Structures are given as structure tokens and as C-alpha cells.
Design a protein around this ligand. Structure first.
Ligand SMILES: Nc1ccn([C@H]2C[C@H](O)[C@@H](COP(=O)(O)CP(=O)(O)OP(=O)(O)O)O2)c(=O)n1
Ligand SMILES: [Mg+2]
Ligand code: NA
Ligand code: NA
Ligand code: NA
Length: 326
DNA sequence: CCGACGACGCATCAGC
DNA sequence: GCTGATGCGG
DNA sequence: GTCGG
């Protein structure tokens, strides 16, 4: 946190552009700048020093000079006083309310937590669950609790079918001391890129986790992605654990390394890595790395037997999960 | 200057 | 019912 | 908002 003041500023600018302006590329530009500054191993002393880094241009350079001189940014100071911008920004903190819904609600006069509760009927199902657990989903999860949640998920999956393999990814796999949620990669030998030899593969896991009252609510659910809510069991007389967000992704077993690379993130690491793959003439998603022809069209999946193979194709030295937190 | 900016699953909606 | 576009999320 | 070409 040598430059926490600067990266916090860029993060608030990114969120403003996403939530209020609906300028998704300004949001990514600010996020990338914040990321590159966050790993810069010196205390930044001017915007011209910062502009040397890739993703910091003239505009951000000027904002960093203002912030270093005064300790604040007038642009943000204004944004904070504007009641509409602040209301739109706040409502997007509810899961399922993005920038469109948030501006829609603030237009309808719904602009506080109390206003959301009174108008619960104007929310779809995801938004209703996001409002229900608003305070809980704001809390971090200590790694110690992540370890207990892992134990439950892995043992309940083993009880359904011993051939499942569940791998916790996200910030947990990157070694974070706390996580925003739990991300679970799931494979089963009956589900490959070649065939699906059993139905309900993800559903049976979700259903087992509901039966033991680990999973408490569902935000969305399809054949390969579950997004919902879970809770650790508490002891007699003990306060309940906060409810937590859980995501589960069932990935074809022969595409595991592309899947765990994707799900380990970070999101900015994946964007940098996939952008780099493009420049090297490949495309990477959670299933495959494929070459690009002269026309630009993706070819056939390349053989992959490790995360490191994916790095090798695009001529990157391997980075362990813990060094992917960008 | 200018196009490009990672890639995709699920929910919801318009239009048929 | 479907396909395609959009919002929102990972 | 930034960048490579
Ligand atoms: N725009 C995105 C968002 C996510 N992902 C991938 C990479 C990310 O680590 C994983 C879980 O995301 P999450 O939303 O769970 C974020 P994570 O890195 O796990 O940190 P926490 O806040 O502690 O949960 O999904 C991606 O590729 N592109
Ligand atoms: Mg996560
Ligand atoms: Na730069
Ligand atoms: Na939201
Ligand atoms: Na999150």
C-alpha cells in the first residue's frame, strides 16, 4: 500500500465511470492504471513518474499531480456531493443491480436502502437476494472460514460421487488472507468436451449442498454455472456466520487447466494475459487456447496438460497463483 | 489519428 | 416456443 | 482513458 491513496482515487474514478457514466472502457482504463500502480515498488512522487508506467496517460498523470499536491481530487469531491451520482453508485452495490437498473431506480425516486426495501416488488429475484444479504455480502471472509467452507464443499461433493473433483479458485487459490466470496471449480469424468454421459451433474452437487443447509439461496443456475448463497454452521449459543456468495463452475474434465487458469484470476490478470495472447496470435478462454489464423479466426484447440503450458504458448514465464493478484 | 480494448454463463426482454 | 440483444455477473 | 502502429 505504498500508493494506496492514488489507487483508491483511480478505483473511485473507475466505479464512477462504470456506474454513473456507463463508460465501460474508462472503467477498465482506470482499473488497469490502478493495477499497474499497485504493483509499482516505489512511492510515486509525481504524475510524470507514474506516466512512465503502461496504462497511465496524460489525464491520469494530471490527476495524480493534483492528488499529490492537495491530497484530494476536485472531480471526485464534486461527484461525492452530487446526490444522483452518489445514489446511483450506492444502489449498484446490491448484487444484481447494475448501472442501468440503478439509474432507472434513482429516476423513480428509489435511492436509499430503505427505498429499496419498500419497493421490493420492483426487483427481480437476483436483486431481491442481493438486498436481503446486502450487509453480509459487504463483509470479507477470513481465510480460516474459507478453509472450513472448502472442507464442507469438498466432502459433500465426495458423498455425491467420489469421481467429482472440486477445486477452490479465485482469491483463495491466490493465497488471499481474506476473500470476497468462494469460487469452486468442479469436474467429473462424465463431462468432457467430447460428451456429457450423465445429466444433472452440477444440479446434484447444488442439491446436496442445499440438503445439508450449506447453500441457502440461488441467484442463477444453469447446467454449468451456479451463483448463490451459503453459510457456515454455527455452534450452540453462537452468533450465526454471515451469509456468503458462492459460485460453482462445472468445466469439462479435459479442459481443467484452462478452467483453473480462468477461475484463479485475478480478473485483471486474465485480461492482461488474454490481451497478451492475442498479440501473440492466440485466443484464451476458460476452455481452450487456440491459434489465430491470418484472417483472425480461431483454429483448433492446442494440447494443454498444465497451467504452465498455457504460459509457454504465449511466451510468458510461469506465474504461481499468488503472483497473479493484479 | 484510430481502432482496439477478454471472454463468456444465466436472466430477462423484444420481436417473431 | 425460438433467436438475438442486453444487463449483470464471474 | 490509453496505446501501438
Ligand atoms: N471480470 C471477471 C471477473 C472474474 N473473473 C474470474 C477471475 C476471478 O478470480 C474469478 C472469480 O472472480 P470473483 O468475482 O470471485 C473475484 P476474486 O478474484 O475471486 O476475488 P474476491 O473478491 O476475493 O472474490 O473469475 C474474470 O475472469 N473476469
Ligand atoms: Mg472470488
Ligand atoms: Na504510460
Ligand atoms: Na450490483
Ligand atoms: Na465480489
Amino acid at each position: 500500500t505504498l500508493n494506496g491513496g492514488i489507487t483508491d482515487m483511480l478505483t473511485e474514478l473507475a466505479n464512477f465511470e462504470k456506474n454513473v457514466s456507463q463508460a465501460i472502457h474508462k472503467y477498465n482504463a482506470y482499473r488497469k492504471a490502478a493495477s499497474v500502480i499497485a504493483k509499482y515498488p516505489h512511492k510515486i512522487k509525481s504524475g510524470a513518474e507514474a506516466k512512465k508506467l503502461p496504462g497511465v496517460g496524460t489525464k491520469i498523470a494530471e490527476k495524480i499531480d493534483e492528488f499529490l499536491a492537495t491530497g484530494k481530487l476536485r472531480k471526485l469531491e464534486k461527484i461525492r456531493q452530487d446526490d444522483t451520482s452518489s445514489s446511483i453508485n450506492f444502489l449498484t452495490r446490491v448484487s444484481g443491480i447494475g448501472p442501468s437498473a440503478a439509474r432507472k431506480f434513482v429516476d423513480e425516486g428509489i435511492k436509499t436502502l430503505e427505498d429499496l426495501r419498500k419497493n421490493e416488488d420492483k426487483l427481480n429475484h437476483h436483486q431481491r437476494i442481493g438486498l436481503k444479504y446486502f450487509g453480509d455480502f459487504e463483509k470479507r471472509i477470513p481465510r480460516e472460514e474459507m478453509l472450513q467452507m472448502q472442507d464442507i464443499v469438498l466432502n459433500e461433493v465426495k458423498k455425491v460421487d467420489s469421481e467429482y473433483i472440486a477445486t477452490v479458485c479465485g482469491s483463495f487459490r491466490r493465497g488471499a488472507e481474506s476473500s470476497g466470496d468462494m469460487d469452486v471449480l468442479l469436474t467429473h469424468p462424465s463431462f468432457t468436451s467430447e460428451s456429457t454421459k450423465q445429466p444433472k451433474l452440477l444440479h446434484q452437487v447444488v442439491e446436496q449442498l442445499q440438503k445439508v443447509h450449506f447453500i441457502t439461496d440461488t441467484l442463477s443456475k444453469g447446467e454449468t454455472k451456479f451463483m448463490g448463497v451459503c453459510q457456515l454452521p454455527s455452534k450452540n449459543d453462537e452468533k450465526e456466520y454471515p451469509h456468503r456468495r458462492i459460485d460453482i463452475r462445472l468445466i469439462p474434465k479435459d479442459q481443467y487447466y484452462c478452467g483453473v487458469l480462468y477461475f484463479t484470476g485475478s480478473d485483471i490478470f486474465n485480461k492482461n494475459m488474454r490481451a497478451h495472447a492475442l498479440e501473440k496470435g492466440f485466443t484464451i478462454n476458460e476452455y481452450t487456447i487456440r491459434p489465430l489464423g491470418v484472417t483472425g479466426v480461431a483454429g483448433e484447440p492446442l494440447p494443454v496438460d498444465s497451467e504452465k503450458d498455457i504460459f509457454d504458448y504465449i511466451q510468458w514465464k510461469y506465474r504461481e497463483p499468488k503472483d497473479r493478484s493484479e
